[PDB]
Amino acid sequence: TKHICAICGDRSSGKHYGVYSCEGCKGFFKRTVRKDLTYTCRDNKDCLIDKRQRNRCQYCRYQKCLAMGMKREAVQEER
Amino acid sequence: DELCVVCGDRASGYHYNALTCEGCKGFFRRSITKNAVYKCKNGGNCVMDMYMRRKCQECRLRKCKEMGMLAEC
DNA sequence: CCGAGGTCATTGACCTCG
DNA sequence: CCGAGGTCAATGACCTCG
Ligand SMILES: [Zn+2]
Ligand SMILES: [Zn+2]
Ligand SMILES: [Zn+2]
Ligand SMILES: [Zn+2]
């Protein structure tokens, strides 16, 4: 609402796992860690992640989350 | 490459008499089936793109009918 | 071969709670 | 207020079929 998402640039409510992010990138990082999914990029691993094409490549989207300093340990275990 | 005339994404061919993508193809199919009526919270002037197609469903369905998506099935 | 139809795993807006 | 957690309808990649 008052913050910018550090991954795609969408409206961010606050910090999630240490970084300003939106509801979309927050859940995407949680889903990847809780299920330990491994993604595979279909291009040169340089897909652009923005408001409109963040869902393009799951690999480069998760790599930007780690690049922006999202702590994987910040994800608790399923209750 | 050819783009979807509704949102500008990579079109997957002609769907319902329009060159659209898999996203707009599925959305236009669900809209006519459910006879859904939407209400825009931005005054019905949302510019359609890959990001705005998930936000406003009124300006999206209007864009599809403006691009000639027929509903005879 | 395309585009009708369909399924269904992912997405993200909207929550509780300490 | 902040950042964890959570649900779930809509979404869209991908399927079969005529
Ligand atoms: Zn984001
Ligand atoms: Zn990629
Ligand atoms: Zn489209
Ligand atoms: Zn609108």
XYZ file of C-alpha atoms (C1' of nucleotides) and ligand atoms in Angstrom:
192
model
C 0.000 0.000 0.000
C 2.807 2.387 0.963
C 5.868 0.374 -0.116
C 7.391 -0.956 -3.335
C 7.980 -4.662 -3.903
C 11.699 -5.333 -4.302
C 11.154 -8.167 -6.810
C 8.497 -6.993 -9.283
C 7.778 -3.407 -8.208
C 4.168 -3.948 -7.125
C 2.506 -2.278 -4.144
C 4.047 -3.691 -0.960
C 2.287 -3.616 2.402
C 5.399 -4.195 4.499
C 8.372 -6.497 4.882
C 8.002 -10.249 4.379
C 10.923 -12.580 5.135
C 13.088 -9.476 5.566
C 12.360 -7.714 2.257
C 9.644 -5.382 1.008
C 7.430 -7.490 -1.241
C 3.860 -7.826 -2.481
C 1.299 -10.523 -1.689
C 2.289 -12.318 -4.893
C 6.028 -12.577 -4.266
C 5.447 -13.309 -0.566
C 3.400 -16.441 -1.212
C 5.630 -17.503 -4.104
C 8.652 -17.557 -1.786
C 6.706 -19.414 0.918
C 5.432 -22.063 -1.501
C 8.916 -22.720 -2.891
C 10.477 -23.199 0.549
C 7.685 -25.180 2.225
C 7.533 -27.646 -0.688
C 11.258 -27.445 -1.607
C 10.452 -27.043 -5.294
C 13.226 -26.729 -7.878
C 12.514 -24.624 -10.965
C 14.222 -24.741 -14.364
C 14.531 -21.660 -16.558
C 13.704 -22.053 -20.249
C 16.061 -19.273 -21.406
C 19.495 -17.867 -20.503
C 18.411 -17.470 -16.827
C 17.919 -13.707 -17.288
C 14.124 -13.438 -17.553
C 12.855 -10.022 -16.499
C 10.664 -9.954 -13.384
C 8.286 -6.988 -13.162
C 4.647 -6.239 -12.346
C 3.321 -7.811 -15.543
C 5.637 -10.732 -16.400
C 6.733 -11.973 -12.982
C 4.885 -15.243 -13.673
C 6.902 -15.762 -16.872
C 9.787 -17.837 -15.473
C 9.581 -19.370 -12.000
C 13.361 -19.869 -11.881
C 14.432 -16.255 -12.404
C 11.636 -15.091 -10.090
C 12.939 -17.242 -7.235
C 16.514 -16.195 -8.035
C 15.592 -12.523 -7.691
C 13.997 -13.268 -4.312
C 17.304 -14.700 -3.094
C 19.188 -11.828 -4.749
C 17.041 -9.227 -2.957
C 18.018 -10.800 0.374
C 14.981 -12.920 1.231
C 15.877 -15.235 4.109
C 14.807 -18.818 3.432
C 15.082 -19.591 7.159
C 12.397 -16.955 7.827
C 9.833 -19.500 6.565
C 8.508 -21.466 9.540
C 7.288 -25.055 9.310
C 3.684 -25.901 8.490
C 1.478 -25.907 11.589
C 6.056 -13.105 -32.710
C 2.289 -12.594 -32.625
C 0.735 -10.994 -29.549
C -2.681 -11.332 -27.940
C -4.836 -8.425 -29.102
C -6.475 -8.125 -25.666
C -3.552 -7.937 -23.218
C -0.422 -8.089 -25.390
C 0.835 -11.468 -24.172
C 2.179 -14.196 -26.461
C -0.917 -15.337 -28.351
C -1.469 -19.068 -28.859
C -3.637 -18.757 -31.978
C -7.177 -17.694 -32.775
C -9.721 -18.376 -30.020
C -13.384 -17.380 -30.423
C -12.725 -15.330 -33.579
C -9.778 -13.430 -32.097
C -6.004 -13.826 -31.848
C -5.714 -14.214 -28.076
C -3.535 -15.914 -25.476
C -4.364 -18.875 -23.252
C -5.090 -16.463 -20.404
C -7.650 -14.366 -22.263
C -9.085 -17.461 -23.965
C -9.928 -19.101 -20.645
C -11.204 -15.853 -19.137
C -13.601 -15.173 -22.013
C -14.907 -18.746 -21.795
C -15.681 -18.489 -18.077
C -17.303 -15.053 -18.438
C -19.995 -16.041 -20.935
C -20.662 -19.382 -19.229
C -21.358 -17.781 -15.840
C -23.023 -14.622 -17.249
C -20.886 -12.718 -14.755
C -21.307 -8.952 -14.369
C -18.283 -7.099 -12.995
C -17.852 -3.665 -11.412
C -14.760 -1.579 -12.135
C -13.234 0.293 -9.194
C -11.245 2.642 -11.467
C -14.020 4.111 -13.634
C -13.989 1.677 -16.549
C -10.834 3.114 -18.136
C -8.235 0.512 -17.132
C -5.546 0.106 -19.789
C -5.259 -3.609 -20.525
C -1.904 -5.360 -20.128
C -0.491 -8.527 -18.568
C -0.745 -6.991 -15.083
C -4.094 -5.189 -15.376
C -5.905 -8.276 -16.713
C -5.821 -9.887 -13.257
C -6.892 -6.657 -11.532
C -9.954 -5.375 -13.409
C -12.269 -7.971 -14.947
C -14.747 -5.406 -16.301
C -12.259 -3.622 -18.560
C -10.896 -7.036 -19.586
C -14.232 -8.487 -20.716
C -14.991 -5.195 -22.467
C -11.651 -5.392 -24.286
C -12.441 -8.916 -25.498
C -15.842 -7.922 -26.889
C -14.196 -4.879 -28.487
C -11.682 -7.160 -30.231
C -14.449 -9.277 -31.762
C -14.581 -12.334 -29.492
C -17.817 -14.036 -30.538
C -19.926 -16.048 -28.078
C -22.039 -18.391 -30.220
C -20.880 -21.664 -28.634
C -3.488 -28.947 -37.740
C -6.532 -25.992 -35.419
C -9.584 -24.709 -31.851
C -13.330 -26.324 -29.551
C -13.646 -28.375 -25.005
C -11.831 -29.779 -20.443
C -8.810 -30.507 -15.950
C -6.210 -28.736 -12.115
C -1.697 -26.959 -9.982
C -0.487 -22.247 -9.204
C -1.538 -17.496 -8.221
C -2.543 -13.674 -5.156
C -6.357 -10.836 -2.764
C -8.180 -11.215 1.848
C -7.938 -13.229 6.353
C -6.420 -14.446 11.929
C -3.269 -13.673 15.744
C 0.306 -12.545 19.129
C 1.377 -1.732 13.882
C 4.249 -5.508 11.980
C 5.166 -10.059 10.144
C 4.404 -14.531 10.752
C 0.620 -17.800 9.739
C -3.633 -19.224 6.872
C -7.814 -19.975 3.230
C -9.600 -20.285 -1.489
C -11.830 -18.289 -5.805
C -9.827 -16.937 -9.938
C -6.227 -17.739 -12.843
C -3.686 -19.944 -16.781
C -0.423 -23.631 -18.422
C -1.530 -27.956 -20.585
C -4.431 -31.568 -21.511
C -7.820 -34.567 -24.823
C -10.927 -34.633 -28.796
C -13.576 -34.024 -32.854
Zn 6.253 -8.692 -6.050
Zn 14.217 -17.599 -16.592
Zn -4.345 -12.098 -23.573
Zn -11.370 -1.135 -15.025
